[PDB]
Amino acid sequence: GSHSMRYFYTAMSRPGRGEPRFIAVGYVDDTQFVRFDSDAASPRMAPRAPWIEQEGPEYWDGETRNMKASAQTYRENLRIALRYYNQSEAGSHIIQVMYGCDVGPDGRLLRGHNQYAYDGKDYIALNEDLSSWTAADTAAQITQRKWEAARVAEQLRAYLEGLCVEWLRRYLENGKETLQRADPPKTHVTHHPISDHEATLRCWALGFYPAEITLTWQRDGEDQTQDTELVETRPAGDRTFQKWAAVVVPSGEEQRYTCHVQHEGLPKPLTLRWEP
């Protein structure tokens, strides 16, 4: 169905311990496919998925050149941010970047993204029109003024509507075996007494891709959102993801509880109960 390409940059200063570290990673959907780390013995854009390995040396040299250039720019931006926020040169600070494109089944641009953070807070973001900016504070407004003057938005629009979509489509075809395969969750319900009158029902989802999933408990057909313990979806390490949802139920009332599982890999939503 729909797909996304995302790049994530992290630039972290470390006064007294050398120049700021720059790490870049690239994703198609929930699959990482490239990385760059300025702290590597030999910094370069490197493959992290099998289907990207077929890209030639001009790809890898070009991307490596770009990441080294980007690293230098974001080291500059870290110095600039200190000024904008009247901060001392003694502290460690972080700039983060996430950008990319979303496409529909036909591979047409759904929307683009280009957003920035400073010390974990929104800094500036390209609006959905890909032509204007939202600045989070008066510091970012300075950046906005600079970027409006230099017409940065137009250049980002050109990338997001062009190369981003084009290369995402290329990656999707080259990695169709995996990127265009949904693995449905393997599911089951576990039961563990807490006491003489209460028990935990835990609904498990395992081995699924992509990460997007909905696990819900119902009691007598009504959602138990507030009484459900829901862990964050977590990576298994083999491309797939895991998740569970638990509720505490009165003993003898277990069969009034149903777990409901929604996932792209499933032809229809699943309903599961504990099976003693």
Binding site: N66, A69, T73, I80, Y99, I142, K146, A150, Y159, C164
Partner: peptide, 9 residues
């Protein structure tokens, strides 16, 4: 493919 130039703040 990454965007080709980073912007100065």
């Amino acid at each position: 493919l990454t965007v080709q130039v980073a912007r100065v703040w």
